[PDB]
Write a structure and sequence with these properties.
Chain C: Belongs to the universal ribosomal protein uS3 family. Chain C: This is Small ribosomal subunit protein uS3. The structure is cut from a larger assembly and holds chains A, B, C, D, E and F. Chain A has strands at 4-6, 17-21, 31-34, 38-44, 52-58, 65-69, 76-81, 86-90, 95-100, 107-112, 118-123, 128-132, 139-140, 150-154, 164-168, 172-177, 182-188, 194-199, 206-210, 216-218, 235-241, 244-251, 254-258, 269-270, 285-290, 296-301, 306-311. By secondary structure, chain A is an all-beta fold. Chain A has a single domain, classed as Methylamine Dehydrogenase, Chain H (7 Propeller). In chain A, the strands form 7 sheets. Chain A has a 4-stranded antiparallel β-sheet, with no helix packed on it. A 4-stranded antiparallel β-sheet of chain A has the order 2-3-4-5, with no helix packed on it. In chain A, a hairpin with a 4-residue loop joins β8 (86-90) and β9 (95-100). Chain C starts with 5 loop residues before the first strand and ends with a strand. Chain D is 43% helix and 5% strand. In chain D, α3 packs across α5 and α4 (128-146) crosses α5 (157-166). A two-stranded antiparallel sheet of chain D has the order 1-2. Classes of the chains: A mainly beta, B mainly alpha, C mainly beta, D mainly alpha, E mainly beta, F alpha+beta. Chains in contact: A-B, A-C, A-F, B-C, D-E, D-F. The D-F interface holds D 5-6, 29-30, 32-34, 36-38, 40, 72, 75-76 and F 37, 39-40, 42-43, 46, 71, 75, 107-109, 111, 116. β17 of chain A pairs antiparallel with β4 of chain C. Chain F binds one RNA strand through residues 1-6, 13-15, 17, 19, 21-22, 24, 26, 29, 60, 62, 64, 66, 87, 114-122.
RNA sequence: ACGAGACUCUGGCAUGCUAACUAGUUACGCGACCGGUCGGCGUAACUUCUUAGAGGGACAAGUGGCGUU
């Protein structure tokens, strides 16, 4: 258990931050996408004076941005927008070099190969579109696929055989191998639509959440409920940390961070708009992430800011 | 004038009656889900129904909505009404009882109860409100 | 919708007492895919599709192939 | 710096009405180098007071079906008489302007009041906005009639009326209108 | 002809034969304890301050 | 380079080509100090001296204009200049001073960045103007 | 249920997208100044600058004061 102390606050933006990107080679500059149709690179000061200032904002979207990723360097990025498009930004020059469109409606999340060679885009049209980076519209799965939207697709960050997992709004998840395009497993057990699924960087701990309100665990290579976890209702974000056994889940208008050894809460962090009466609601959280080395917590909220929490041991 | 007509209100009512769980928390999610499962001819109308869906769901967090008959609302009402203390409000040591109801109890074979207490009758018979 | 959902014809009748003027206005029902009425639905009306059932096991289960 | 026309200083104005600087403002951040910003305040309510009063002037001595659609002429004619009050009183025209707006600005008016009668009038308090509106209207009416058919040109009739209304002199047509309003307020209680 | 201060705290309504005036409640700043009613003519904002000849005037009241 | 993002007022528009040049601002072959009405020059030097004449340190800005009305072109030529400054100051250099100057000119007015959506409405028959109607005959 | 609303063209952001040789500003001299400036326009030419397409966007959606809340 580590205290999550108050580093300060970040402000100077006018949009809900939906996807926050961390590059494990630049612990000083990180990317974050906000649904005012922009994706911004931060500058990190890490002092009591101020958290930092935005560095460079890239805009290429007619509608809002849903998910973003970084390929292998702070000079590249891939961004999916709510207009159904994917754009490959070259952050060495701050422009877009390639566009990707195979969808007829919104795109919720985009995946990218750990080798930066495969692009996976999940849309609302119950089709998951998989491209090669060459520019070929290579495949979609349409035989007994997801019967609803594809809320999120995530990729294994460990160098291994690629293994996709996709969460649908039909209260089910599907884990697939794109080597043979053959169904691997279909999972049910939630009591609501899923919103985010993320895979720990070894293909062992799979985390799922959403309208079910309870985090549900599977094994990428076994296919069974790992444990029944109790938490706050409505998981707007949940993911492990690729340095330590912590799992951070954004549940309700607050966030929880748990261990898997005994399933206890180390620090329950609530961001609250306090009213003297029943007048408003707490600013709800959307996304959670750790730093490049995974010792500071970034939380993307709907109050047009990214909050930063520091490790101080308390 | 920003009054929402019966078309918007009634379509939103049917949607929240029918797809209460399918709804979202953000308006932009609400319009997308509404356009998924409704033949709404135009963008403006689906926007208006989505917006009243957001307002109705905001009204849901504090109480029921009159035109909605969702099962989850009944479950919420029946859970809220399932409250009980450890001590019943009718479980009290001393019950003040007037002499006339004491005589009623005594003629009812209950004059031997020691749980009651004599409360003295009123001084006078001044209980009518003045006339005119 | 009076452009397409309603079809109108005006006519004159010439009898030995004078002239009788008629208008016939026929509404077309909604017949998409079949050419009897207009293909497009009535723009002001909304229809909600029937719900999709739920299957919610209390105990999580997996479906291997 | 934000000096008017780049030549009249704006960091010198003193309204001296305790709390009226929100309804008569030339210091406010909306006060610009020129009084020309096109009409955008008239659309909504209580936004008219956010106007830089220089604009309200250059549009109030802008009327009568012969001037409408000639706003650049009004801006030239306000540059004129701004550089003229710069020399006539030897002071910043904004000071005499605020003096005129603080004295000519009416307080008491008389209006018909009642749901069932029509015999007489009743005294009423004219709000700051309406008071500046009708004061600038009287000033512009005098300045039009003072140079109407007369050999005296613009920027001097306006100038004369402004100076003899700014000091509280009753010789001004606007100040005599103010006195008439006050006396009719007296005579209709 | 003494003059004191008065500032609006409650816009009671609109009066006049054809909506001429606003019956508004005004407090005296120098006393901050008295509320009086005035049929103020013109657009009135809630919280404006005006110098007045009158400190006791009342108009038609309903 | 073309980082031009319109800059408009009424039906007249301006495109502010910007490059690394001399710091002289040109308006279709004439300097901004000399424009046909001879009256709105201050309206054109307002943005630069409001944010600071020192900002231009070797930036050549040529604005090309087209549309109806001279004054209609102004409030868009200067809007185009402000847009070009915004694009230059967003492309590479920091944002803290960018936000400082943005706050200063935003409190100065609003017609330097965001265009006025207003436009001339049509005229309705049965009258001399769109809203005015003919006199009633008794 | 008709009418109102809804509808449709739109005025108004397309910096995102199909895309011009009846559209248009910038890689080298054409008549001038140790580098800046042309609607006779310089070789080279990208959709930003006019037209006309699809999708998006604005909903009392967000906060505060009133309201039979």
């Amino acid at each position: 258990t580590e205290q999550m102390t108050l580093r300060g606050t970040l402000k100077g933006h006018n949009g809900w931050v939906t996807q926050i990107a961390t590059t494990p080679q630049f612990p000083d500059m990180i990317l974050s996408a906000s649904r005012d149709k922009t994706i911004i690179m931060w500058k990190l000061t890490r002092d009591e004076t101020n958290y930092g200032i935005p560095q460079r904002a890239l805009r290429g979207h007619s509608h809002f941005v849903s998910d973003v990723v970084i390929s292998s360097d702070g000079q590249f990025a891939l961004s999916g927008s709510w207009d159904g498009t994917l754009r490959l930004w070259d952050l060495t020059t701050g422009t877009t070099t390639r566009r990707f469109v195979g969808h007829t409606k919104d795109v919720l999340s985009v995946a990218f190969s750990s080798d930066n060679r495969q692009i996976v885009s999940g849309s609302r049209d119950k089709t998951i579109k998989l491209w090669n980076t060459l520019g070929v519209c290579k495949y979609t799965v349409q035989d007994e696929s997801h019967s609803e939207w594809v809320s999120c697709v995530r990729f294994s960050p460990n160098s291994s055989n690629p293994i996709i997992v996709s969460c649908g709004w039909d209260k089910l998840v599907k884990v697939w191998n794109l080597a043979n395009c053959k169904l691997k497993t279909n999972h049910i057990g939630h009591t609501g639509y899923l919103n985010t699924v993320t895979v720990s960087p070894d293909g062992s701990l799979c985390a799922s959440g959403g309208k079910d309100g309870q985090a549900m665990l599977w094994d990428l290579n076994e296919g069974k409920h790992l444990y029944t976890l109790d938490g706050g209702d409505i998981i707007n974000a949940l993911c492990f940390s690729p340095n330590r056994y912590w799992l951070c889940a954004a549940t309700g208008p607050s966030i929880k961070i748990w261990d898997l050894e005994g399933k206890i809460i180390v620090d329950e962090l609530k961001q609250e708009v306090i009213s003297t009466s029943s007048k408003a609601e707490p600013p709800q959280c959307t996304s959670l992430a750790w730093s490049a080395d995974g010792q500071t917590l970034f939380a993307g909220y709907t109050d047009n800011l990214v909050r930063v929490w520091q490790v101080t041991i308390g | 004038g920003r009054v929402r007509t019966k078309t918007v209100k009634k379509a939103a009512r049917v949607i929240i009656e029918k797809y209460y769980t399918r709804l979202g928390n953000d308006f932009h999610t609400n319009k997308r889900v509404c356009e998924e499962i409704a033949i709404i001819p135009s963008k403006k109308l689906r926007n208006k129904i989505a917006g009243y869906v957001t307002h109705l769901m905001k009204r849901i967090q504090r109480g029921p909505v009159r035109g909605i008959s969702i099962k989850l609302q009944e479950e919420e009402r029946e859970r809220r009404d399932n409250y009980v203390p450890e001590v019943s409000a009718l479980d009290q040591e001393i019950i003040e009882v007037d002499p006339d109801t004491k005589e009623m109890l005594k003629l009812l074979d209950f004059g031997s109860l020691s749980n009651l207490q004599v409360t003295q009758p009123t001084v006078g018979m001044n209980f009518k409100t003045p006339r005119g | 919708p009076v452009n397409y959902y309603v079809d109108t014809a005006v006519r004159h009748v010439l009898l030995r007492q004078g002239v009788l003027g008629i208008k016939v206005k026929i509404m077309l029902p909604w017949d998409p895919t079949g050419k009897i009425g207009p293909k497009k639905p009535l723009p002001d009306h909304v229809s909600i599709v029937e719900p999709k059932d739920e299957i919610l096991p209390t105990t999580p289960i997996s479906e291997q192939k | 710096d934000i000096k008017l026309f780049g030549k009249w200083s704006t960091d010198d104005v003193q309204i001296n009405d305790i709390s009226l600087q929100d309804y008569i403002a030339v210091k406010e951040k909306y006060a610009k180098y020129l009084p020309h910003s096109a009409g955008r305040y008239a659309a909504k309510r209580f936004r008219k007071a956010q106007c830089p009063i220089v604009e309200r002037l250059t549009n109030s001595m802008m009327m009568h079906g012969r001037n409408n659609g000639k706003k650049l002429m009004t801006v030239r004619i306000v540059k004129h008489a701004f550089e003229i009050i710069h020399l006539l009183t030897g002071e910043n025209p904004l000071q005499v302007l605020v003096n005129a707006i603080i004295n000519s600005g009416p307080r008491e008016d008389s209006t018909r009041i009642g749901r069932a009668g029509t015999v007489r009038r009743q005294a009423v308090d004219v709000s700051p906005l309406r008071r500046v509106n009708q004061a600038i209207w009287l000033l512009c009416t005098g300045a039009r009639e003072a140079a109407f058919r007369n050999i005296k040109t613009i920027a001097e009739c306006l100038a004369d009326e402004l100076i003899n209304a700014a000091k509280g002199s009753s010789n001004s047509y606007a100040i005599k209108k103010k006195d008439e309003l006050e006396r009719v307020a007296k005579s209709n209680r | 002809q003494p003059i004191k201060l008065a500032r609006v705290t409650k816009v009671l309504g609109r009066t006049g034969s054809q909506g001429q005036c606003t019956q508004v409640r005004v407090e005296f700043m120098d006393d901050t304890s008295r509320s009086i009613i005035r049929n103020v003519k013109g657009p009135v904002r809630e919280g404006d301050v005006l110098t007045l000849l009158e400190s006791e005037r009342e108009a038609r009241r309903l | 380079q073309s980082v031009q993002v319109f800059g408009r007022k009424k039906t007249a528009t301006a495109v502010a080509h910007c490059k690394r040049g001399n710091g002289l601002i040109k308006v279709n072959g004439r300097p901004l100090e000399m424009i046909e009405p001879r009256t709105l020059q201050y309206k054109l030097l307002e943005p630069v001296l409001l944010l600071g004449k020192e900002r231009f340190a070797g930036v050549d800005i040529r604005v090309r204009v087209k549309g109806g009305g001279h004054v209609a072109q102004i409030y868009a030529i200067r809007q185009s200049i402000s847009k070009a400054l915004v694009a230059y100051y967003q492309k590479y250099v920091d944002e803290a001073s960018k936000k400082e100057i943005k706050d200063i000119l935003i409190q100065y007015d609003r017609t330097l960045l965001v265009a006025d959506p207003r436009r001339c409405e049509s005229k309705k028959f049965g009258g001399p103007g769109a809203r005015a109607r003919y006199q009633k005959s008794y």
